[PDB]
């Protein structure tokens, strides 16, 4: 537990091989997941209120 160990390890070795592609795919899928949640799901009312506030 030093001042910065995870960051040091990442700099020395790097992130995961598919981290960028996986993150981009997750971001793309979030668009469809938002619609699925809106059409699905108390929880549904809260999600609708949050979306309206956004």
């Amino acid at each position: 537990p030093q001042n910065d160990y995870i960051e040091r390890h990442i700099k020395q070795h790097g992130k995961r091989l598919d981290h960028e592609e996986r993150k981009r795919k997750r971001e793309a899928r979030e668009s469809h997941k938002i619609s699925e949640r809106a059409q699905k799901l108390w929880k549904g009312k809260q999600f609708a209120k949050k979306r309206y506030a956004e």
Partner: peptide, 10 residues
Amino acid sequence: IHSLEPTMRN
């Protein structure tokens, strides 16, 4: 610069 390492491969 190690920040560009993913570019060399992808």
